[PDB]
């Protein structure tokens, strides 16, 4: 039944419009490339294609080299398996990141929607997701979750997710 496991419609339904539209864009990109799963690297690459976001600002305020990050994400994308003839699906890590972003957004910040900065915090607080993230770029080892949780507004500045 619909009540055996948490549904994607409920889980992803907690995303704000920027994050959810970027899941959609990531799916379209993933499919064009023939990659078998929509992954964190597709989602983060699509978020960084926008004019601005929490992720842009967190990169800036954390002292990450955004050009290096862009290089690393492009290279990770180019290395994914291609020519998938299977039906595309979402990576388990993308589902898990939304759950952890909901936990921190709703409990730590008292907020009804998950913005991309809460996705970053939820990832950093989960060892398997943090390992996946740094696997995409060693730049993400520069993130400091204690700073990001205590000084969130300073890190996200004038992000449109405000």
Q: Which helix (H) or strand (E) holds 90?
A: strand 89-90
Residue 4, SS3 per DSSP: coil
| Resolution attained, angstroms | 1.5
Phi, psi of 143 (to 5 degrees): -70, 140
Chain centre to alpha carbon of residue 21? 12
Considering only the top CATH level, what class is 1-162?
mainly alpha
Nearest to 122 by CA among 141, 95, 90: 95
């Amino acid at each position: 039944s619909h009540m055996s496991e948490i549904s994607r419609v409920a889980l992803f339904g907690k995303l704000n419009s920027l994050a959810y539209k970027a899941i959609e864009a990531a799916t379209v990109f993933c499919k064009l490339r023939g990659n078998p799963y929509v992954e964190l690297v597709h989602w983060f690459h699509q978020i960084l294609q926008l004019p601005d976001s929490d992720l842009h600002q967190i990169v800036r305020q954390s002292g990450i080299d955004p050009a290096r990050l862009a290089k690393d994400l492009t290279e990770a994308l180019d290395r994914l398996p291609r020519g998938s003839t299977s039906i595309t699906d979402l990576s388990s890590h993308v589902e898990e990141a939304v759950e952890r972003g909901w936990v921190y957004g709703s409990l730590m910040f008292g907020e009804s929607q998950v913005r991309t900065g809460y996705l970053v915090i939820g990832i950093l607080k989960t060892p398997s997701l943090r390992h996946a993230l740094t696997g995409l770029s060693a730049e993400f080892a520069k993130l400091k979750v204690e700073a990001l949780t205590e000084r969130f507004d300073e890190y996200v500045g004038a992000s449109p997710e405000n």
